Amino acid sequence: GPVKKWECTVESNPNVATFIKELTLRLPDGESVDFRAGGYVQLECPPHVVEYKDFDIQPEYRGDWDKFNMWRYVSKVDETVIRAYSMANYPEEQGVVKFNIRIASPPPGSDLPPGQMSSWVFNLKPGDKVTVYGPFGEFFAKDTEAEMVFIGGGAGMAPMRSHIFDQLRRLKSNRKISFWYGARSLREAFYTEEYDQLQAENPNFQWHLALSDPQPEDNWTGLTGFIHNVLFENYLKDHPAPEDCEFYMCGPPMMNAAVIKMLTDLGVERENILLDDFGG
Ligand SMILES: Cc1cc2nc3c(=O)[nH]c(=O)nc-3n(C[C@H](O)[C@H](O)[C@H](O)COP(=O)(O)OP(=O)(O)OC[C@H]3O[C@@H](n4cnc5c(N)ncnc54)[C@H](O)[C@@H]3O)c2cc1C
Ligand SMILES: [Mg+2]
Incomplete structure (x- = not known):
């Protein structure tokens, strides 16, 4: 209307x-x-x-x-x-x-x-x-039982949070869902307590923070580098059927482009990738 x-x-x-x-x-x-x-x-x-x-x-x-x-x-x-x-x-x-x-x-x-x-x-x-x-x-979740992979960067966190809470708390979904967020350092990561709690409460959900430039105060021993490389190396490279996953992407332009290229190279069809393009 x-x-x-x-x-x-x-x-x-x-x-x-x-x-x-x-x-x-x-x-x-x-x-x-x-x-x-x-x-x-x-x-x-x-x-x-x-x-x-x-x-x-x-x-x-x-x-x-x-x-x-x-x-x-x-x-x-x-x-x-x-x-x-x-x-x-x-x-x-x-x-x-x-x-x-x-x-x-x-x-x-x-x-x-x-x-x-x-x-x-x-x-x-x-x-x-x-x-x-x-x-x-228009950046809406598909109504299936397929595995979901959410990828975010920057202010793309906003629709990521909306989607993930909607799956886990409104829909009470049992779908396999993961969330991969790239940021420069710990000071640039937010909602971390919310995602850790959602992972503790929902055994079908896992999230991952990758830092490109961890700072000394972070004492970081977690994932590092660009999110497209991290997601490939730590999950998709060994996945039995990535083409069967639904991918939902929202980040800065360089991230959007690198993630989509990585996914298409793996054989994921463009129809299985939904992008929320902020137009940066
Ligand atoms: C569906 C949708 C959802 C969105 N959701 C979000 C969201 O959740 N969060 C969010 O942060 N953004 C979001 N965006 C983006 C948002 O709408 C704005 O485009 C963004 O905030 C920038 O707008 P602005 O008016 O601040 O900057 P603009 O005035 O549009 O300027 C953008 C940039 O261009 C620079 N610039 C100015 N003049 C020139 C020039 N001549 N040549 C080159 N560069 C120039 C400016 O300095 C600035 O860095 C979304 C966009 C869409 C379409
Ligand atoms: Mg004022």
Whole structure:
């Protein structure tokens, strides 16, 4: 049916990684968005000016905001903008829409304008008003009993969380499900306690974190490198029938491309790979 519209209030907007915030919007009037896991809404901003030095960035992330010279950026937006963001909540988490949003700052060294909507999102404080439109979606789980392999990176965590909670807690599914998330270091990993608990509670579910640049403080002895190599070496290379799995992918462009190439090379048919392309 026609697009619905809600004037929401910001409940919380902390960083969950150095360059990713978890934005939670409370819907008005006790309403909920009738969305499906993997779906999205559009957020809108009015004309504005935002200065990055005004952002609230939690303490452990600030050193890299200094290193990346982020505090000098200013974004001037002369007209209303709309952008899609994927729900990180699943449908049984009512009354809110929750997001994982990467700050799309200018490439280091360039003179390009900062990202219009994400810069505005990073200055949202509890109590601010945000207009939301939707729901929309196409990145939906197939209705089968096949093994599921979820692959995520960056703010692609949002539909990954939605999908995984939907399978395990709403559908109470017993399908074989794994989740593979690539990040730079432990400070860039989030929802780790949630996934560890879901693995403890659901013997059909397993997750894996691979770090590309583990930091000394991480004392990391787990998987390292790029997620497409990790998933191949530690699981798919020896899998009896990878072509029988359903793959659900959402990451930054380079990750999407590398994972899809790895899978197609293994003989997985493109029909068995569902991609949520954020268009980065
Ligand atoms: C279905 C869907 C779901 C999505 N879900 C999410 C999600 O859950 N989380 C999320 O973080 N994103 C998501 N996205 C992406 C999101 O909609 C935005 O595209 C993203 O936030 C960037 O928008 P922006 O307005 O901040 O940046 P834009 O203003 O669009 O700019 C993007 C980048 O381009 C740079 N730039 C500016 N001018 C130029 C130029 N001339 N040449 C080159 N580069 C330039 C900017 O500095 C910035 O880095 C989704 C997209 C879709 C389609
Ligand atoms: Mg303000």
